[PDB]
Structures are given as structure tokens and as C-alpha cells.
């Protein structure tokens, strides 16, 4: 398992669970020196619990399917929460057995029916560390409007944040203060699949994307990136889904 304390987190203690987090994740190869996940795990194995405390210890474990970084559901006190899709359905075969009652949320785990339930797309909402604590709070008793918007600020600063360290130092700069995502990590939380399918073609292609992907920098200025030497590459995906998903 992994956990986060957000009472005492400083940028240091949080980028440490990220890369907390990026390790639990198994992989059996690098391709470019970046942790290539697996294209398939049977039965629980699939799924890492990831404890979450907010600032007064109050706690939600999150279940992550490690093959994709997708966050399935969580576990508040005696209630587990899953998404509305097949693959949240099998999770709850595995995780959070003893819960007392099982709530399947109104709503699947992907963006568009998230933005949809909570009334706002990701560019309107503001995440950081404290945007974190609220969402923790608001999943420990139910409340699936409330819960939409706290899903969408907690797969930004979980699972985005493993994903690309850009993200993961726009979450240490929103240590203290929530700010709304930048242009470039909307864009990157976009480009995850298409830039994991490009690294892996770009093995057999002399590093050159098959397709090249338009991201938005650091800067806000549109970008292609063509190869493997981009810094989008060499420096920022920390995890590739398998081209097999
Ligand atoms: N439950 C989730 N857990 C982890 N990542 C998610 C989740 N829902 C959405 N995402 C991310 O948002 C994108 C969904 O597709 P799209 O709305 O078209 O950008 C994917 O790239 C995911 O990495
Ligand atoms: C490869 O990408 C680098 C870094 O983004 C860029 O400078 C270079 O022009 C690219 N090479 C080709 C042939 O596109």
C-alpha cells in the first residue's frame, strides 16, 4: 500500500509519495528509462490502496488499478464508492470486502462524466494539497454531486501527478493555495495515452513518433513533439500505459 498525511505535507513529503506511488506500480521493462506498465494483473493484485489523511487524520483508502493508474473507488468508514463502469464493478469483487453497503456512484471515472456530474470542466477547478484535504472530507460521507468535483480534484493530484512530474511540481507550487490547472497540465492529462502509444512505436522507429502529438508547454504555446529527445520525454511522463490497453 501507499499513504499521504496531509497534516505536516510540504512539497518535499508529497513529491516523496508520488514517487511513493510511481513505485508500487510493477513493471518488467524501461522502455526510453521510463517504467513501462503491465499490460495485464488477475484477481486482487490488480488493485493498490492508497490511504489518504486529511488535516484532522480523517482517512479514505483509494483502490488503483496499477495496470493503468485509474482510480476504480474508495472505502469512507464502513461505505465503499465505485465508479459506474465494468471495470470498477470487478474491482469491487476484490477491494473493500467488509465494507458494510457498497455504493455504486451515479457517474463513471472518466473526465467527461465527471465534468458532467459536477457541473464544471477540470480548467474551472482549482486543485493543490488543500483542494486535496476538502475532497478527502467531502468523500467521507456521501454526497455524489460534491463527490464529483472531490474525484476530480483527487485524480489530479494522485494519479495525473504519478504520471508527469510537470504535474507533480504544479501540485508542490498548490501546497498552500488551490489555483486551477495550468493550460499544460489539462493538455497532458489528455496526451497520456496517445504519448505512451508513440514511445513505445518510437522502439522499432529510431525514437521518431509514428504519429507526432500536439501538447501545450510550460509557456501556454501549442507544441508537436516528434521524438524521443523532446524534455516531455527525457524528463516529465514518469509511467507509459501498455500499447496492449
Ligand atoms: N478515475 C480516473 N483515474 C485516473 N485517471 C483518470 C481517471 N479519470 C480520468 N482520468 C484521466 O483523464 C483522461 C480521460 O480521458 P479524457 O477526458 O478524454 O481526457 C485520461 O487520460 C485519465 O488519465
Ligand atoms: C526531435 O525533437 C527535438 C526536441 O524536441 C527537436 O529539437 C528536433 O527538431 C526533433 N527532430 C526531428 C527530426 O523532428
Redesign the pocket.
Known amino acids: 500500500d501507499v499513504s499521504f498525511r496531509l497534516s505536516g505535507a510540504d512539497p518535499r513529503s508529497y513529491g516523496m509519495f508520488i514517487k511513493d506511488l510511481r513505485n508500487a506500480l510493477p513493471f518488467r521493462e524501461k522502455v526510453y528509462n521510463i517504467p513501462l506498465l503491465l499490460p495485464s494483473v488477475s484477481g486482487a493484485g490488480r488493485y493498490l490502496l492508497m490511504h489518504l489523511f486529511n488535516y484532522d487524520g480523517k482517512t479514505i483508502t483509494v483502490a488503483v488499478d496499477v495496470t493503468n493508474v485509474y482510480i476504480m473507488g474508495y472505502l469512507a468508514d464502513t461505505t465503499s464508492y465505485f465508479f459506474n463502469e465494468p471495470a470498477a464493478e470487478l474491482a469491487s469483487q476484490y477491494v473493500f470486502r467488509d465494507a458494510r453497503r457498497k455504493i455504486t456512484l451515479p457517474y463513471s471515472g472518466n473526465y467527461e462524466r465527471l465534468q458532467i456530474a459536477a457541473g464544471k470542466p477540470r480548467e474551472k477547478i482549482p486543485i493543490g494539497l488543500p483542494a486535496l484535504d476538502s475532497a478527502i472530507s467531502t468523500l467521507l460521507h456521501y454526497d455524489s454531486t460534491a463527490a464529483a468535483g472531490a474525484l476530480l480534484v483527487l485524480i489530479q493530484t494522485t494519479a495525473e501527478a504519478a504520471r508527469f512530474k510537470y504535474i507533480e511540481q504544479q501540485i508542490q507550487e498548490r501546497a498552500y493555495r488551490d489555483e486551477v490547472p495550468s493550460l499544460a497540465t489539462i493538455s497532458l492529462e489528455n496526451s497520456w495515452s496517445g504519448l505512451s502509444k508513440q514511445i513505445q512505436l518510437a522502439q522499432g522507429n529510431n525514437g521518431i513518433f509514428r504519429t507526432p502529438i500536439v501538447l501545450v508547454d510550460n509557456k501556454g504555446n501549442r507544441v508537436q513533439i516528434?521524438?524521443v529527445?523532446?524534455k516531455v520525454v527525457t524528463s516529465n511522463i514518469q509511467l507509459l500505459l501498455n500499447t496492449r490497453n
Do not use: E, I, Q
Request: hydrophobic share 0%; net charge neutral; no cysteine.
Open positions: 516528434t521524438n529527445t523532446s
